[PDB]
Amino acid sequence: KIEEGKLVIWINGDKGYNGLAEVGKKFEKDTGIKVTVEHPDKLEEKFPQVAATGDGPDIIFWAHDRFGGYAQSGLLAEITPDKAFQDKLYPFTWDAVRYNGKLIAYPIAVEALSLIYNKDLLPNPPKTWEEIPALDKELKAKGKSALMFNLQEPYFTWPLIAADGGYAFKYENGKYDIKDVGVDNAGAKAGLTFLVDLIKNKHMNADTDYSIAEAAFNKGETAMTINGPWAWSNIDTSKVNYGVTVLPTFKGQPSKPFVGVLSAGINAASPNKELAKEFLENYLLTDEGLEAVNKDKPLGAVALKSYEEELAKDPRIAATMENAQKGEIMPNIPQMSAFWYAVRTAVINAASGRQTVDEALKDAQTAARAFAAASGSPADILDELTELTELAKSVTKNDGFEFYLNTFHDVMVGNNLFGRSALKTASELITKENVKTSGSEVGNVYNFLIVLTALQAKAFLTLTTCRKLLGLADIDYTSIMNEHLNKEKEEFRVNILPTLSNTFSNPNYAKVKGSDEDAKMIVEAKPGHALIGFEISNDSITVLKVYEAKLKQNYQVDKDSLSEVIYGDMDKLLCPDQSEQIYYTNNIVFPNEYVITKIDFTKKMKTLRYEVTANFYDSSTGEIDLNKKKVESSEAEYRTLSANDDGVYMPLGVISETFLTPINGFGLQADENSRLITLTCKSYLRELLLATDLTKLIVPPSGFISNIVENGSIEEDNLEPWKANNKNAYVDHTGGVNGTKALYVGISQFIGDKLKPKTEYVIQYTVKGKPSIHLKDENTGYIHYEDTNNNLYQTINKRFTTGTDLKGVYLILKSQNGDEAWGDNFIILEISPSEKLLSPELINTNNWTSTGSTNISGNTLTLYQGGRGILKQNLQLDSFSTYRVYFSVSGDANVRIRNSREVLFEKRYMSGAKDVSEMFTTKFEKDNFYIELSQGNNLYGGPIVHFYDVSIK
């Protein structure tokens, strides 16, 4: 229940509250806004008590170290000072008031411990710490001590300890790493050891409190003391002429005192956030405002650059600022509470002799880190429970995770089921639910065994760590786990693996319309490589991924040589449009030492054949012979698929074993009723598994390897070829797509030499907003692909070709007519070349043979009336191929294409037949085939017959 139109300020009583009230009176007399400055006791503890319920002051004045804990609970409002105002204050003071990249308070003053000395007895103060023990003896004879400061609090003894490299929490990238504590390093040891040695040599007293130290110095009983600007007011009254200088250096390095920044935060529950902003930015953080506070009680150094230059004329303020820059900014995280207790107890124990410096700091680093799981049993048990919950989510994407847990338990207690082992009954369930899944039975069941043993390994690992956490006696569960493991391997190898099938097919289908034109597609591996995996996916474009790689011993894939080649126009074959398509179907299977390296698809005259090449593979050397080949094809058995204007259901999904392995079988099946086209292959996984039981298997990648765009997905480290253009291009907006990073707008990346001239590519990107994506040559201006102004994340997928202009091609993401745009997961893919079906002419003029009266005049073939003419030309045909005879005929003629035994085509035209186009096919017989032009009858010698434009391709 806060009021509006009024400002209420809470500032500590040690501050100049009367001066801040005078600035408030100036604020009210210029704006009408009442400013009430209150100085409550326990102000650091009372603010979170009242602010948690929504009440409290509008502005809170305290050191920045406690404002992180306030921002933790969302008690401070995010201030929004413009860039012009931010430059009026020192940049290091803005970092003290920054929490998780958010500004939470305005910095007012800067304070830090400094060396205070008595000029009457010490004209020049000692520059280094090591001089103090020597100089102490020379003044002890005169009845005085050298140095006396507060030893009970660690805030005072820390600059000496942190001199040689001590630190509370490692500061990196604006974040305090709670797992890195620097109290037990060599630097902190040397620091505290010197402090203890000063006490052992009776140069300092381990019981000196704040009161004892201040009294000794202000009455000239000691030469030096360490204190802050707050202590100046009390020595001013004593008139003991004092100077404030830099702190002594230790081991050549300067003392590092903690730096406190007096900050003014705005209550996140205050309804006067605009009123508070005006008071702080325009009235308090000014030369007149800070001076008014300074006149009441000194502020020391100030964050305002303007007024600090005026204050630096005082050597005391210049010294506090000098010491502050040498020291380290106080961490504002709440874990400092453990740090303070750790160092406070360590210095006390080390001074009193209860512990040595090595012992005090070792447990101090344990206590400082205590808010994070200590390395060992506590840290591991948390990592093991998290890794186990990930394994749970791995097998709950609809069996279930509890199925694995039940099966795992049944193996441990030796609970056999249905007479066979529990692994067998679990395996039979795998082959009864994974029937429409990528991979074969060998792959799917072996994958089940991998997860089962991975859970088995974690269960035994969790047990071991749980016993260490409980202080229980060590037990080595390695042999009892290995015993269970070998029993599981033996069961799968002898009882489960042989009865499993090694055939895998496509898991899904997609209703798709292709083309009716002839087409060729040759999937071939590089010399020495083998085809190892396939994936068909159709999102507006049909893309075929083929995986090849070198082979190692026993059908293992060479991870170093794994390549991914992209083939386009997969839908253009396997699918007709408005017409029929004949699919020749023969399951090809090679012997047990040959690996498929080449699949040759041939679409000719609405017929689809394939010819598979398999080279010989050696199980002792990784060599695949380039000359010991075997070639089989879809020979003669054909299925016919009617026109059906609504498509043909192309095969979709991952045609691969669950682990990338070579294949020795391939076949296409087409159902004449359901129009389902099914690709099926046989895998080498069982031969691999039977030969090696030593996860060196490779899983078929989900995304596209060989992606031309580097860093395409922007979810990696700042390593990126993307270049921002020196504008508001926003390197890495974290919180983009799905939660991950995304490009905000612009950004450009050079691809350039990775492109090929006059080659077809596929671009894909998930963008939102109004993006202007261009793939243009920044030298000639040639645009290879453009995505101009388009409406509101969607994954656009288009296919394009480049031309002759590549030595400057960039992928540029910018916006249209000044708007914003987000783009993620850019993909550019090369489409390996396909080749045009070469159907040559098989009829030549000089290859005709005559019987009877005939005549050959150009394109006209004439069978004379009286002469019983028969023309015959031999045809050079292949074993399993589709051809087409074309001609026009006028007389009563009979065309027939025949061999000594087989006939491919025969028809009698007892009338004019213009533009005849008949297809014929060969079945394993290719030699001694000929076309025979003759008359339909031979009565009276036959009628006159003219053949026009005879052609066979």
Numbering used by the authors: 21 to 418, 421 to 716, 721 to 771, 776 to 822, 825 to 985
Please give me the paper's original passages concerning this structure.
Vegetative insecticidal proteins (Vips), which are produced by Bt during its vegetative stages, have a wide spectrum of insecticidal activity, especially against lepidopteran pests. Compared with known Cry toxins, Vip3A toxins share no sequence homology, bind to different receptors, and lack cross-resistance, therefore they are considered as ideal options to complement and expand the use of Bt in crop protection and resistance management. Vip3A toxins are large proteins (~789 amino acids) consisting of a conserved N-terminus and a variable C-terminal region.
Here, we report the crystal structure of the C-terminal fragment of Vip3A toxin (Vip3Aa11200–789). The final structure of Vip3Aa11200–end was refined to a 3.2 Å resolution with R and Rfree values of 0.1980 and 0.2389, respectively. The crystal belongs to the P21 space group and four MBP-Vip3Aa11 molecules were found in one asymmetric unit. However, domains III/IV and IV/V are connected by long and flexible loops, which indicates that the relative locations and orientations of these two domains could change under different biological circumstances. Domain II of Vip3A has an all α-helix fold, including two conserved hydrophobic α-helices. Several studies have reported that domain I of 3d-Cry toxin is involved in its membrane insertion and pore formation processes through its conserved hydrophobic α-helices. This therefore suggests that domain II of Vip3A may also take part in these processes through its conserved hydrophobic α-helices.
